[PDB]
């Protein structure tokens with residue numbers, strides 16, 4: 001009788017609690033008619049704790065939407081950390097900037113507007129400690145190649161949505177399952193990466209993520 | 218037949234891990250000694266390895282060794298200068314694990330400490346620990362987490378295995394590991410020294426999940 005969404009509601013109440021900044025971000029995202037595809041609270045808290053564990057101070061995110069995952073990354077990187085997040089849609093970037101300011105992390109985050117393949121070669125500063133790749137899935141492999149080039153040795157790369165209900169193994173007419181399957185094959189074969197993939201369930205259904213360490217950059 | 222999580226894990230194993238004769242030998246030795254086949258899956262073990270590597274862990278504490286499968290992955294992630302202390306109360310499990318760690322080339326990084334963890338944890342001087350993996354008798358998760366906080370550095374990572382148990386944490390069944398998991402999660406959420414999340418997983422081992430926490434303060 002218990003199902004993964006019910007368990008996630010319990011985990012949210014038990015481990016995350018009331019989050020008025022993310023509640024406001026959801027309402028603002030809804031008012032702007034953004035798709036409800038942001039990370040769940042357990043998933044966002046995972047990104048936050050991952051950034052905190054490695055003491056990430058330079059974080060790259062590809063795919064901002066309304067800034068939900070971005071807020072979590074900025075929380076984990078802390079007041080000394082900086083997050084650069086890339087977003088193709090001007091309307092998404094504008095909502096995210098408002099959501100970031102209301103969550104109190106605007107001093108830590110820059111939203112860079114444009115196709116990520118055009119903005120990544122000009123991104124400056126220093127090498128990244130953590131890269132979260134969550135944009136157009138057909139460019140996952142290009143984004144991972146960029147992540148390796150722009151990350152420090154030992155940086156963490158996280159790729160969202162790599163399982164898609166098992167569609168990566170099924171003759172499924174799902175462009176992003178095709179992309180996710182090729183992404184996993186590329187990560188396994190790449191000599192500069194050491195990677196794992198964890199299948200997940202919860203409020204967003206059966207999916208999963210890839211996590212890799214940059215061996216050489 | 219549509220793909221299921223075990224099928225997907227087999228693909229992930231073949232694609233991201235590949236042939237691993239050290240872990241193949243560890244499984245075979247564990248089977249030969251009739252250990253329960255309840256080790257972490259390869260994707261789960263690799264996650265522990267990459268987590269230790271990501272935080273550059275040099276002192277790792279594991280509670281619940283079995284045949285050393287999770288231990289091998291932790292030792293791989295800690296590197297040649299890293300050290301793992303792993304606690305096991307069954308002498309036969311400890312003996313199998315020591316053989317498996319040697320064949321995995323990590324015996325010089327790992328100490329298996331034999332005895333009930335509640336009795337050996339106060340004798341440990343191998344800290345402060347950077348990473349604690351809690352995977353032993355579930356009714357003592359909460360005690361082991363309290364010890365982990367005491368023995369860890371600030372900012373250390375604590376991972377607790379098997380905290381979902383097929384959704385049983387929401388049921389009122391006389392189910393020891395689900396009752397313990399629910400209490401474990403409630404304790405972690407309430408502890409002012411911990412910041413925690415829990416991820417539900419599927420795969421070879423079915424619907425389960427893990428808790429991950431940062432030690433915010435000793």
Ligand SMILES: Nc1ncnc2c1ncn2[C@@H]1O[C@H](CSCC[C@H](N)C(=O)O)[C@@H](O)[C@H]1O
Pocket residue numbers: 037038039062063064065066067068069070086087088089092114115116117134135136
């Ligand atoms: N080529 C591209 N470059 C940058 N962003 C892109 C892109 N293609 C799609 N996107 C953006 O990627 C986002 C994916 S949804 C991202 C969700 C977010 N990470 C969260 O969990 O809260 C969308 O906002 C979409 O506009």
Ligand SMILES: Nc1ncnc2c1ncn2[C@@H]1O[C@H](CSCC[C@H](N)C(=O)O)[C@@H](O)[C@H]1O
Pocket residue numbers: 255256257280281282283284285286287288304305306307310332333334335352353354
């Ligand atoms: N009180 C206790 N102290 C130390 N070890 C204990 C214990 N109670 C149970 N155990 C041990 O905990 C182990 C749980 S199975 C551990 C599996 C292992 N972590 C892997 O993934 O490969 C068993 O070997 C069991 O004997």
Ligand code: NA
Pocket residue numbers: 187188189190191192193194195
């Ligand atoms: Na690889």
Ligand SMILES: [Sr+2]
Pocket residue numbers: 037038039134160161
């Ligand atoms: Sr996503």
Ligand SMILES: [Sr+2]
Pocket residue numbers: 173
């Ligand atoms: Sr079609």
Ligand SMILES: [Sr+2]
Pocket residue numbers: 255256257352378379
């Ligand atoms: Sr276990």
Ligand SMILES: [Sr+2]
Pocket residue numbers: 391
């Ligand atoms: Sr009983």
Ligand SMILES: [Sr+2]
Pocket residue numbers: 382392393394395
């Ligand atoms: Sr049970």
